[PDB]
Coordinates of C-alpha atoms in Angstrom, one line a residue:
Chain A
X1029 CA 136.9 191.0 176.8
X1030 CA 133.7 187.8 177.1
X1031 CA 134.0 185.6 180.3
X1032 CA 136.7 183.6 179.5
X1033 CA 140.4 182.8 178.4
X1034 CA 140.9 180.7 175.4
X1035 CA 144.1 178.9 174.9
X1036 CA 145.1 178.5 170.9
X1037 CA 146.9 175.2 169.7
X1038 CA 148.4 175.2 166.3
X1039 CA 150.9 173.2 164.1
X1040 CA 154.4 174.5 162.1
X1041 CA 155.8 171.7 159.8
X1042 CA 159.5 172.4 158.6
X1043 CA 161.1 170.8 155.5
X1044 CA 164.5 169.1 157.1
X1045 CA 167.4 167.8 155.5
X1046 CA 169.2 164.2 157.4
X1047 CA 171.8 162.1 158.1
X1048 CA 171.5 158.6 158.6
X1049 CA 174.5 156.5 160.2
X1050 CA 175.3 153.1 160.4
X1051 CA 177.2 149.9 160.6
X1052 CA 179.6 147.9 158.5
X1053 CA 177.2 144.6 157.3
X1054 CA 174.8 145.5 160.2
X1055 CA 172.2 144.2 157.4
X1056 CA 171.9 141.8 154.8
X1057 CA 169.7 142.2 151.7
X1058 CA 169.3 138.7 149.6
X1059 CA 167.8 139.2 146.1
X1060 CA 167.4 137.1 142.8
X1061 CA 167.6 137.1 139.2
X1062 CA 164.6 140.3 138.2
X1063 CA 161.8 138.3 136.8
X1064 CA 159.3 140.0 133.1
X1065 CA 156.0 139.6 133.6
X1066 CA 153.4 140.3 130.9
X1067 CA 150.0 142.1 130.3
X1068 CA 149.0 142.0 126.6
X1069 CA 146.7 145.3 124.8
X1070 CA 145.9 145.8 121.6
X1071 CA 147.8 149.2 120.8
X1072 CA 150.3 148.7 123.4
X1073 CA 151.7 145.6 125.8
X1074 CA 153.4 146.4 128.9
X1075 CA 155.9 144.6 130.9
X1076 CA 156.7 144.8 134.8
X1077 CA 160.0 144.0 136.2
Chain B
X1 CA 153.5 132.7 97.7
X2 CA 155.0 129.1 97.4
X3 CA 153.6 125.6 98.3
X4 CA 156.0 124.6 100.7
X5 CA 155.2 127.9 102.7
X6 CA 151.6 127.2 102.5
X7 CA 152.0 123.4 103.8
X8 CA 154.2 124.7 106.8
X9 CA 152.9 124.1 109.9
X10 CA 152.1 126.6 111.5
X11 CA 154.0 129.2 113.5
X12 CA 155.3 127.3 116.8
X13 CA 155.6 130.2 119.9
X14 CA 155.7 127.3 122.3
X15 CA 159.5 126.9 121.2
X16 CA 160.6 130.7 119.2
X17 CA 162.6 133.0 121.4
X18 CA 160.6 136.1 122.5
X19 CA 160.4 139.2 121.4
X20 CA 163.5 140.3 124.3
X21 CA 165.2 137.1 123.1
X22 CA 165.3 138.1 120.1
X23 CA 166.7 142.1 120.3
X24 CA 169.0 140.9 122.9
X25 CA 170.3 138.2 120.8
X26 CA 170.9 140.7 117.6
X27 CA 172.8 143.0 119.4
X28 CA 174.4 140.2 122.0
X29 CA 173.8 142.0 124.9
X30 CA 173.0 140.9 128.3
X31 CA 171.6 142.9 131.1
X32 CA 171.0 141.0 134.4
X33 CA 167.3 140.9 133.9
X34 CA 166.1 137.2 133.0
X35 CA 164.2 138.2 130.1
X36 CA 164.4 134.2 128.7
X37 CA 160.7 133.3 129.6
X38 CA 157.8 135.7 130.2
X39 CA 155.6 135.2 132.8
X40 CA 151.6 135.1 132.1
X41 CA 152.8 134.4 128.8
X42 CA 150.1 131.8 127.8
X43 CA 147.7 133.0 130.4
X44 CA 144.1 133.3 127.9
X45 CA 142.0 134.7 130.6
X46 CA 141.7 138.6 130.9
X47 CA 142.9 140.0 133.8
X48 CA 141.2 143.5 135.4
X49 CA 143.1 145.6 138.5
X50 CA 140.8 147.9 140.4
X51 CA 141.7 149.7 143.6
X52 CA 139.1 149.2 147.4
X53 CA 138.9 150.6 150.6
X54 CA 140.6 148.6 153.4
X55 CA 137.5 148.0 154.5
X56 CA 135.6 145.5 152.2
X57 CA 138.8 143.7 152.3
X58 CA 137.4 141.3 155.0
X59 CA 136.5 137.7 153.2
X60 CA 138.4 138.6 150.1
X61 CA 141.8 138.2 152.2
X62 CA 141.1 134.2 150.7
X63 CA 141.2 134.2 147.6
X64 CA 137.7 134.3 145.1
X65 CA 135.2 135.9 145.1
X66 CA 132.4 138.1 142.8
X67 CA 133.3 141.2 142.8
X68 CA 130.4 143.7 142.3
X69 CA 130.3 147.5 141.6
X70 CA 128.0 149.6 142.8
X71 CA 126.7 153.7 141.7
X72 CA 126.2 156.3 143.7
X73 CA 125.3 159.6 142.7
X74 CA 128.0 161.9 144.6
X75 CA 130.8 163.8 142.5
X76 CA 133.5 162.4 144.8
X77 CA 134.1 158.2 144.5
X78 CA 131.3 157.6 141.5
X79 CA 131.8 153.6 142.3
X80 CA 132.4 151.8 145.2
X81 CA 134.2 147.3 145.0
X82 CA 131.7 145.6 147.0
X83 CA 131.8 141.9 147.6
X84 CA 128.9 139.3 147.6
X85 CA 129.1 138.6 150.8
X86 CA 128.7 142.0 152.1
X87 CA 125.8 141.9 149.7
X88 CA 124.0 139.4 151.8
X89 CA 123.5 142.1 154.8
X90 CA 120.8 143.8 152.4
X91 CA 119.8 140.2 150.9
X92 CA 116.0 138.4 152.8
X93 CA 117.0 135.7 151.7
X94 CA 119.8 135.1 154.7
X95 CA 119.0 133.2 158.0
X96 CA 119.2 135.6 161.5
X97 CA 122.1 133.7 162.0
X98 CA 125.0 134.3 158.9
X99 CA 123.2 138.4 158.6
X100 CA 124.2 138.3 161.8
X101 CA 127.8 137.3 161.6
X102 CA 128.0 139.0 158.4
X103 CA 127.3 142.3 160.2
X104 CA 129.5 141.9 163.2
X105 CA 132.9 140.3 160.8
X106 CA 131.8 143.8 158.5
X107 CA 131.3 146.6 160.7
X108 CA 134.5 148.9 159.3
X109 CA 133.3 152.6 158.6
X110 CA 133.4 152.4 154.1
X111 CA 131.3 149.7 154.4
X112 CA 128.3 151.0 156.1
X113 CA 128.4 153.7 153.9
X114 CA 128.2 151.6 150.7
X115 CA 125.3 150.0 152.3
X116 CA 124.0 153.9 153.2
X117 CA 124.4 154.5 149.5
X118 CA 122.3 150.7 148.2
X119 CA 118.8 151.8 150.1
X120 CA 119.3 155.7 150.0
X121 CA 118.6 155.7 146.5
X122 CA 114.5 155.5 145.0
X123 CA 116.2 152.6 142.6
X124 CA 115.9 149.4 143.0
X125 CA 118.8 147.0 143.3
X126 CA 119.0 145.6 139.1
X127 CA 119.7 149.3 137.6
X128 CA 122.5 149.9 140.7
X129 CA 124.3 146.8 140.2
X130 CA 126.8 145.3 137.7
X131 CA 129.0 142.0 137.7
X132 CA 133.3 141.8 137.4
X133 CA 133.8 138.2 137.8
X134 CA 136.3 136.9 140.6
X135 CA 138.5 137.9 142.2
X136 CA 142.3 136.6 142.9
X137 CA 145.1 137.9 145.0
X138 CA 145.3 140.9 147.9
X139 CA 148.4 143.1 148.9
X140 CA 146.8 144.6 152.3
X141 CA 147.1 148.6 153.2
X142 CA 145.0 151.0 153.8
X143 CA 143.7 151.1 150.2
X144 CA 144.3 147.2 148.8
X145 CA 144.8 146.2 145.8
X146 CA 142.4 143.7 143.8
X147 CA 143.1 141.6 140.7
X148 CA 140.2 140.1 138.8
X149 CA 139.1 138.0 135.5
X150 CA 136.0 139.0 133.5
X151 CA 136.7 135.8 130.7
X152 CA 139.1 133.4 132.1
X153 CA 139.7 130.1 134.0
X154 CA 140.7 130.8 137.6
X155 CA 144.6 130.1 138.4
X156 CA 147.6 130.8 140.1
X157 CA 150.3 132.7 138.2
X158 CA 152.3 129.5 137.6
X159 CA 149.3 127.8 137.3
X160 CA 150.5 125.5 140.1
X161 CA 147.0 125.0 141.4
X162 CA 143.4 126.1 140.3
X163 CA 141.5 128.8 142.0
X164 CA 138.0 128.3 143.3
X165 CA 135.4 130.5 144.2
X166 CA 132.8 130.3 146.8
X167 CA 129.6 131.3 147.3
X168 CA 127.2 131.3 150.9
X169 CA 125.4 129.1 151.7
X170 CA 121.7 130.7 152.1
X171 CA 122.4 131.9 148.5
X172 CA 122.8 128.4 146.7
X173 CA 120.2 126.9 145.2
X174 CA 119.2 124.1 142.8
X175 CA 116.3 123.7 140.4
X176 CA 116.9 119.9 139.4
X177 CA 117.9 116.4 141.1
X178 CA 119.9 115.1 138.9
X179 CA 122.6 117.1 137.6
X180 CA 124.4 116.7 133.9
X181 CA 127.7 117.2 133.4
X182 CA 127.8 120.4 132.2
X183 CA 125.8 123.0 134.1
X184 CA 125.9 126.9 133.9
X185 CA 125.6 129.1 137.1
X186 CA 123.3 132.4 137.0
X187 CA 123.2 135.5 139.8
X188 CA 119.7 135.6 140.7
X189 CA 117.4 138.8 142.3
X190 CA 114.0 138.6 143.3
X191 CA 111.8 141.5 144.3
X192 CA 108.9 141.5 147.3
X193 CA 106.6 144.1 146.8
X194 CA 104.2 143.4 149.3
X195 CA 106.1 144.9 152.5
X196 CA 106.4 148.6 152.6
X197 CA 110.1 148.1 151.3
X198 CA 110.8 147.0 148.2
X199 CA 112.5 144.0 150.1
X200 CA 115.3 142.1 147.4
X201 CA 116.3 138.5 147.5
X202 CA 119.5 137.3 146.5
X203 CA 120.0 134.2 144.8
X204 CA 123.6 132.5 143.3
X205 CA 121.6 129.2 141.0
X206 CA 122.9 126.4 139.4
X207 CA 121.1 125.0 136.2
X208 CA 122.2 122.8 133.4
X209 CA 120.0 124.7 131.1
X210 CA 121.7 127.1 128.7
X211 CA 118.9 128.3 126.6
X212 CA 117.0 131.7 127.9
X213 CA 113.3 130.8 127.4
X214 CA 113.2 127.4 129.9
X215 CA 114.9 128.8 132.0
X216 CA 112.6 132.3 133.1
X217 CA 109.6 129.8 132.4
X218 CA 110.9 127.7 135.7
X219 CA 112.3 130.5 137.1
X220 CA 108.8 132.5 137.1
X221 CA 107.5 128.6 138.5
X222 CA 109.7 129.0 141.6
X223 CA 108.7 132.1 142.5
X224 CA 105.3 132.6 141.7
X225 CA 104.8 134.1 144.9
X226 CA 107.2 136.8 144.4
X227 CA 105.4 137.9 141.2
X228 CA 101.9 137.7 142.3
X229 CA 103.6 140.4 144.8
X230 CA 104.2 142.2 142.6
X231 CA 101.4 142.0 140.6
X232 CA 99.5 142.4 144.0
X233 CA 101.9 145.5 144.2
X234 CA 101.1 146.7 141.1
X235 CA 96.9 146.9 141.4
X236 CA 97.1 147.4 144.7
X237 CA 98.9 151.3 144.8
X238 CA 98.1 153.3 141.0
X239 CA 100.4 156.0 140.3
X240 CA 103.2 154.0 141.6
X241 CA 105.5 152.7 138.3
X242 CA 106.6 149.2 139.6
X243 CA 109.0 146.4 137.2
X244 CA 110.4 143.3 137.0
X245 CA 109.5 140.7 139.5
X246 CA 112.8 139.4 138.8
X247 CA 116.0 139.8 137.0
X248 CA 119.3 137.6 135.9
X249 CA 122.4 137.5 134.9
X250 CA 124.4 134.9 133.6
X251 CA 127.7 134.4 134.7
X252 CA 129.6 130.8 135.1
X253 CA 130.8 127.7 133.5
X254 CA 131.5 124.5 135.7
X255 CA 131.7 121.1 135.2
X256 CA 128.4 119.5 137.9
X257 CA 131.0 116.7 139.3
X258 CA 132.9 119.6 140.6
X259 CA 130.7 121.3 143.4
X260 CA 131.7 120.8 146.8
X261 CA 130.4 122.2 150.1
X262 CA 133.4 124.4 152.8
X263 CA 133.7 126.3 155.7
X264 CA 135.7 129.5 154.8
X265 CA 136.8 131.1 158.4
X266 CA 138.4 134.8 158.3
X267 CA 139.3 136.6 162.1
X268 CA 138.8 133.3 163.5
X269 CA 135.1 133.3 162.2
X270 CA 133.6 130.8 160.2
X271 CA 131.3 131.0 157.9
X272 CA 129.4 128.5 155.3
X273 CA 129.7 128.4 152.3
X274 CA 129.6 126.5 148.0
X275 CA 132.7 126.0 146.3
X276 CA 133.2 125.2 142.7
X277 CA 136.8 124.6 141.7
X278 CA 137.3 124.0 138.2
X279 CA 135.2 126.6 137.6
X280 CA 135.9 129.6 134.6
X281 CA 133.9 133.2 134.2
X282 CA 131.2 134.1 130.9
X283 CA 129.9 137.5 131.7
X284 CA 126.4 138.6 130.1
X285 CA 124.2 141.6 130.9
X286 CA 121.5 141.6 133.2
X287 CA 118.4 141.5 132.0
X288 CA 114.5 140.8 133.1
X289 CA 112.0 138.9 133.6
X290 CA 108.0 139.2 134.3
Chain C
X3 CA 153.6 137.5 111.6
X4 CA 150.9 138.6 109.8
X5 CA 146.6 138.3 111.2
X6 CA 143.6 138.7 109.6
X7 CA 143.2 142.4 108.2
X8 CA 140.8 144.1 105.7
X9 CA 142.5 146.8 103.5
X10 CA 140.8 150.1 102.2
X11 CA 142.1 151.9 99.4
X12 CA 141.3 156.2 99.5
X13 CA 140.2 156.3 95.9
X14 CA 140.6 160.1 96.8
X15 CA 144.3 161.8 97.0
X16 CA 145.1 162.8 100.4
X17 CA 147.3 165.2 101.4
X18 CA 150.2 165.4 104.2
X19 CA 148.2 166.9 106.5
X20 CA 144.8 165.1 105.9
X21 CA 147.1 161.7 106.5
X22 CA 148.6 163.6 109.7
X23 CA 144.7 164.4 110.9
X24 CA 144.0 160.5 109.9
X25 CA 146.7 159.4 112.2
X26 CA 145.2 160.5 115.4
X27 CA 142.3 157.6 115.6
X28 CA 144.9 155.4 115.6
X29 CA 142.7 153.1 117.0
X30 CA 138.9 154.5 116.5
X31 CA 136.0 152.1 115.7
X32 CA 134.6 152.0 112.2
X33 CA 131.9 150.4 110.5
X34 CA 132.0 148.1 108.0
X35 CA 128.6 147.2 105.4
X36 CA 130.2 144.4 104.3
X37 CA 133.2 141.9 105.7
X38 CA 135.1 142.2 102.3
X39 CA 139.0 142.3 101.7
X40 CA 139.2 145.4 99.4
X41 CA 137.0 148.1 100.7
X42 CA 136.7 151.5 98.8
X43 CA 136.5 154.8 100.7
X44 CA 133.4 155.8 100.2
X45 CA 132.3 152.7 102.8
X46 CA 133.4 153.6 105.5
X47 CA 131.6 155.7 108.3
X48 CA 128.2 156.2 108.3
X49 CA 128.6 159.2 105.6
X50 CA 126.9 157.1 103.0
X51 CA 123.9 156.4 105.1
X52 CA 122.5 159.6 106.3
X53 CA 119.8 160.9 104.5
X54 CA 117.1 163.8 104.4
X55 CA 114.0 162.7 104.8
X56 CA 115.8 159.1 107.0
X57 CA 116.2 159.8 110.8
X58 CA 118.0 158.0 113.4
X59 CA 116.1 155.1 114.4
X60 CA 116.8 153.9 110.2
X61 CA 120.6 154.8 111.9
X62 CA 120.6 152.8 114.6
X63 CA 118.9 150.1 112.4
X64 CA 121.1 149.8 109.9
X65 CA 124.1 149.9 112.1
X66 CA 122.5 146.7 114.2
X67 CA 123.4 145.3 110.8
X68 CA 126.4 146.8 110.5
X69 CA 129.7 145.3 111.0
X70 CA 131.9 146.7 113.7
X71 CA 135.7 147.0 112.8
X72 CA 138.8 148.9 114.5
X73 CA 141.6 150.2 113.4
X74 CA 144.7 150.2 112.6
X75 CA 148.3 151.7 111.5
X76 CA 147.5 153.9 108.6
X77 CA 150.4 154.1 105.8
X78 CA 151.9 155.2 102.8
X79 CA 148.5 155.1 100.2
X80 CA 146.9 152.5 102.6
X81 CA 145.2 151.8 105.6
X82 CA 144.2 148.7 107.8
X83 CA 141.5 148.3 109.3
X84 CA 141.1 144.6 111.8
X85 CA 137.8 143.0 112.1
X86 CA 137.6 142.0 116.3
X87 CA 137.0 138.1 117.2
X88 CA 134.9 138.0 120.6
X89 CA 136.6 137.3 123.9
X90 CA 139.7 138.7 122.9
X91 CA 140.4 142.4 124.0
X92 CA 141.3 145.7 122.4
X93 CA 142.0 149.4 122.0
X94 CA 139.4 151.8 121.2
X95 CA 139.4 156.0 121.1
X96 CA 136.0 157.3 123.1
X97 CA 135.0 159.1 120.3
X98 CA 131.7 159.7 123.0
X99 CA 130.7 162.8 124.9
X100 CA 130.7 160.3 128.0
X101 CA 133.6 159.9 130.3
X102 CA 134.2 155.9 131.0
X103 CA 135.1 154.2 134.0
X104 CA 136.1 151.0 134.9
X105 CA 134.0 148.2 134.6
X106 CA 131.2 150.5 132.3
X107 CA 129.1 148.6 129.9
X108 CA 129.2 150.3 126.1
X109 CA 126.6 149.7 123.4
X110 CA 127.2 151.5 120.3
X111 CA 124.9 154.4 119.0
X112 CA 124.6 156.3 115.6
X113 CA 125.9 160.0 116.0
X114 CA 123.9 163.3 116.8
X115 CA 126.9 166.1 116.4
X122 CA 137.0 169.5 116.3
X123 CA 135.2 167.9 113.0
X124 CA 136.5 164.9 110.6
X125 CA 138.5 166.0 107.0
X126 CA 136.4 165.8 104.4
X127 CA 136.2 165.5 100.0
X128 CA 134.9 166.9 97.7
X129 CA 131.1 164.8 98.2
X130 CA 132.4 162.9 101.2
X131 CA 132.3 163.2 104.6
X132 CA 134.3 161.2 107.6
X133 CA 131.8 160.3 110.6
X134 CA 132.0 157.2 113.3
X135 CA 129.8 156.7 115.4
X136 CA 128.6 156.8 119.5
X137 CA 130.6 155.0 121.9
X138 CA 128.3 154.9 125.1
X139 CA 127.7 153.4 128.6
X140 CA 124.6 151.2 129.1
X141 CA 122.3 153.2 131.1
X142 CA 122.9 156.8 129.2
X143 CA 121.3 154.8 126.2
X144 CA 118.9 153.7 127.4
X145 CA 118.2 157.0 128.5
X146 CA 119.0 159.4 125.2
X147 CA 116.3 156.7 123.1
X148 CA 113.6 157.2 125.8
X149 CA 114.1 160.6 125.9
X150 CA 114.5 160.7 122.4
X151 CA 111.1 158.3 121.4
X152 CA 108.8 160.0 123.6
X153 CA 109.7 163.4 121.9
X154 CA 108.7 161.6 118.9
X155 CA 105.8 161.4 120.8
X156 CA 105.5 164.9 121.7
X157 CA 105.3 166.0 118.5
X158 CA 102.0 166.4 117.4
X159 CA 100.9 169.1 120.1
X160 CA 104.2 171.0 119.5
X161 CA 101.9 174.2 119.6
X162 CA 101.7 174.3 122.9
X163 CA 103.2 176.0 125.2
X164 CA 103.4 173.4 128.0
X165 CA 104.8 171.0 125.5
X166 CA 107.5 173.2 124.1
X167 CA 108.7 173.5 127.7
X168 CA 108.4 169.9 128.2
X169 CA 110.5 169.4 125.3
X170 CA 113.0 171.9 126.1
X171 CA 113.3 169.7 129.9
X172 CA 113.5 166.0 128.1
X173 CA 116.0 167.5 125.5
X174 CA 118.6 168.3 127.8
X175 CA 120.3 165.3 129.4
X176 CA 122.5 164.8 132.5
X177 CA 125.6 162.4 133.6
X178 CA 128.7 162.2 134.9
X179 CA 130.4 165.3 134.7
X180 CA 128.6 165.7 131.1
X181 CA 125.6 168.0 130.8
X182 CA 125.1 168.0 126.9
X183 CA 122.2 168.3 124.9
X184 CA 120.7 165.9 122.2
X185 CA 118.7 167.4 119.0
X186 CA 114.7 167.8 119.4
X187 CA 113.8 165.3 117.0
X188 CA 111.0 167.5 114.8
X189 CA 112.0 170.2 111.8
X190 CA 109.5 172.4 110.7
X191 CA 107.1 171.0 113.1
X192 CA 106.9 167.5 110.8
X193 CA 108.3 164.5 111.6
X194 CA 110.8 162.3 109.9
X195 CA 109.2 159.2 108.4
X196 CA 111.4 156.4 110.4
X197 CA 109.9 158.5 114.6
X198 CA 106.5 158.5 112.1
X199 CA 106.4 154.7 111.8
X200 CA 108.7 153.9 115.3
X201 CA 106.3 156.0 117.4
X202 CA 102.8 155.2 115.4
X203 CA 103.6 151.2 116.1
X204 CA 104.7 151.9 119.9
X205 CA 101.3 153.8 120.4
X206 CA 99.1 151.2 118.1
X207 CA 100.2 147.9 120.0
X208 CA 99.3 150.2 123.5
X209 CA 96.2 151.0 121.7
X210 CA 95.5 146.7 120.7
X211 CA 95.7 145.4 123.5
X212 CA 93.5 147.2 125.8
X213 CA 90.6 146.0 124.0
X214 CA 92.2 142.7 123.0
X215 CA 93.6 141.4 125.9
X216 CA 90.2 141.1 128.0
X217 CA 88.0 137.6 126.0
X218 CA 90.9 135.7 126.8
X219 CA 91.6 136.9 130.1
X220 CA 88.7 136.3 130.9
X221 CA 88.7 133.2 129.1
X222 CA 91.6 132.0 131.1
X223 CA 90.6 132.4 134.6
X224 CA 88.4 129.7 135.0
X225 CA 91.7 127.4 134.7
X226 CA 94.6 129.4 136.4
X227 CA 96.1 127.4 139.1
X228 CA 99.0 130.4 139.5
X229 CA 96.0 132.2 140.4
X230 CA 97.7 135.7 139.4
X231 CA 95.3 135.6 135.9
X232 CA 92.5 136.4 138.0
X233 CA 94.2 139.5 139.2
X234 CA 94.8 140.6 136.3
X235 CA 91.6 140.1 135.1
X236 CA 90.8 142.6 138.0
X237 CA 93.3 144.9 137.0
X238 CA 92.2 145.2 133.3
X239 CA 88.7 145.5 135.0
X240 CA 89.6 148.8 137.1
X241 CA 91.2 150.2 134.0
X242 CA 87.7 149.5 132.1
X243 CA 86.0 150.8 135.0
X244 CA 88.8 153.9 134.8
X245 CA 87.5 155.1 131.7
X259 CA 82.9 140.9 115.6
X260 CA 83.8 138.4 112.7
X261 CA 86.5 135.7 113.4
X262 CA 88.8 136.8 110.2
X263 CA 88.5 140.5 111.5
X264 CA 90.3 138.6 114.4
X265 CA 92.9 136.9 113.0
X266 CA 93.7 140.0 111.0
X267 CA 94.4 142.2 114.3
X268 CA 96.2 139.3 116.2
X269 CA 98.7 139.9 113.0
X270 CA 98.7 143.6 113.0
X271 CA 99.1 143.0 116.8
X272 CA 102.3 141.0 116.7
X273 CA 104.2 142.7 113.4
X274 CA 103.4 146.0 115.3
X275 CA 105.3 144.2 118.0
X276 CA 108.4 143.2 115.5
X277 CA 108.8 147.2 113.8
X278 CA 109.2 147.9 117.8
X279 CA 111.8 145.2 118.4
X280 CA 114.1 147.8 116.1
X281 CA 114.6 149.3 119.8
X282 CA 113.9 147.3 122.7
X283 CA 117.3 145.2 122.6
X284 CA 120.4 146.7 122.7
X285 CA 123.9 144.5 121.6
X286 CA 126.2 145.0 124.6
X287 CA 129.2 145.6 121.9
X288 CA 132.0 146.7 125.2
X289 CA 133.0 146.2 128.2
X290 CA 135.8 148.4 129.8
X291 CA 138.9 147.8 131.5
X292 CA 141.3 150.4 133.4
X293 CA 141.8 154.0 132.0
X294 CA 144.4 157.0 131.3
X295 CA 144.2 159.7 132.4
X296 CA 144.2 160.7 128.3
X297 CA 140.6 159.2 129.2
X298 CA 139.9 159.5 125.2
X299 CA 141.8 156.3 124.7
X300 CA 140.6 153.3 127.0
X301 CA 140.9 149.9 126.6
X302 CA 137.9 146.7 126.9
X303 CA 137.2 143.6 125.4
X304 CA 134.5 142.9 122.7
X305 CA 131.6 140.8 123.1
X306 CA 128.8 140.3 121.0

C-alpha cells in the first residue's frame, strides 16, 4: 500500500424508454406549403423540399 | 426536318411547364407540395456548400466576404476554410489598431490553430492558399453552414436584393486616379525578404487594366522596394532559394461607379471596410511575377 | 430538347458484356483529336498517339492541342460525347490515383499506367485528372530524372533516382515510371532536357555584357545588384552575326521549353461523394 488512498470516479450510460405527457392543444404549429429548390448537376439533378 | 420547325422561335422555359408539373399533369395527381414554381430555377451563379468550425464564422455573420481554403499536412482535416478578414492578422500591410481589433475579435480556439498552421511550415503563403470566391449565408452552431459562389452575380434567393462584397480598408489599393466605367479587382500578395521572417503583405487591387503584361509592369513599378528586397536576400544569403517577390490572382469584375466606403459591425465592435455592391466573381489561378 | 453532342460509332462489333463494361464510365473524360460531328472509334482516347520512340512530353503537348470532351449515355450501337463550354458545370469520373477535396484545382495529364476494354488492334486509354500541385511535382521530378539519365552508372545516381521516383500525397503513395529505358533517353525527353540545359548555359555567358551596359542608367537601381550577383557567380567559378544567332538560339530554345512551362487549369471542384470516384466540377479554358 502506498501512502495515499485514492478515490475513483466513473460514468455509466443506460438505454431507456421514455413516456412523454402533454395537454390538448398546449402548443400550436404554423406551417406553409412545402417549397422546392433546385440544384443542377449534369448527371443528376436534385431538389430540396 | 421541316422549314416551319427550323424557322420557329426558340423554346421558352419562360412559360413552359416545369418537369414535375408535367408528370403530375400526366397522371392527374396532386401532392401537398407547392410544386409549380421551382426556386433557383433561373439562377446563373454556380453555388458550392462548405462546413466550417464555429470559431471562424465571425465577420461572416454579415453576408459577403472572401472565403479562402488553406492547407495543413496533418492526416486529420487537411483543409480549413478561412476568411480574408482573419488572414489580415498575419499581413504586415495592416495598421496596428486594425490588427489589434482583429486579434481581439477572432480569439476563438479554432482560429489560432489556423494561424499556427499558416506559419509553422517552411513554404510561403502563395503555395499554401487558394481562393473560393464570395460567401452569402449563415446557419450558426458548433459547426456552421456556408454557401458560396465561384462564377456568379452575387444575390439573395429571390434576387430581392444584391449582396455586396466587403474588403478591409487597410488592404485596399488603387493605382489610378480616374476610373473607367469597367475595372477589374485582383488579389495581391507580396513578400519582404529583408526581415528575418519572409514577411508577407496582403493587398486587394482595383484596376481598369485587363491585360496581364501591363498590370505586371505597373505592379513591378509600385513594388520596387519589395523586388529590391528579394534581390538583396538572393545575393546576401546563398544556398537559400527564394522566389516570386509577388504573386497575382484575378478575382472579380465590377462597375466602377458602384464602389462605396462603409463601416461593418460585429460583437458591437466596429471595422472599416470598402464595399462593392453590383459585384460579380470571375476566378483565375495564382501566377508569379519577378 | 436536344443539345450539342458528338456522335461516335464503334466500327468493330461490341458484345453485350463489352457494352456493360463501357457503361461504367458514364461521365469520364475522353479526348478527341478534331471537333467533327460523327467521329470513328479509332480517334477516341490516346492509343493512336502512343509510340515506342516518342515520349511522355510529346503526349503532353498533343493533349494540350487536343480537344477535351465529356461522355454521355451509351446506347444501341452508338455512344454520345458532349463537348463542354466554358463556365458551365459538369460531372467527371476521378480516374486518377489521387483523391480530391472541395476547392481543388485540376489539370489533365497523359497517363502513366482493372484495365479498359481492348480490340484486335486497339485499346482504350484515358488521361489522368490530377490536382495542380501534384502535377507540378510529378513534372518536376520526371524532368529532373531525365537529367540524371546520363550519370546513371554511379550508385549515388541510382539511389537519388529511386528517391525521386516515389511520390507522396494525401493518402496516395504511388510510384511514377523511370523516364529511361535500356540506359537510353526517349528523343522528346532528350530534346526537352537539352533545351533547358542549353537555355541555362547560354544565359551564364551572354547576360554580363548587356547587364553591365544597362547598369549606367537604371533608376530602379536593382539592375546594379543583379550585375554584382553575376560577378559573384563569376567569382564562384565576337562577330555580330554570331551574337545575333546566339540570341535567336536562346529564345528559340526557351520557346521549345514552353511546352512544359504553363499549366491549363481545366477544372475546379465542387463537393464530392463518398463514392469519391465520381465528382462534380466547373469547366475552365
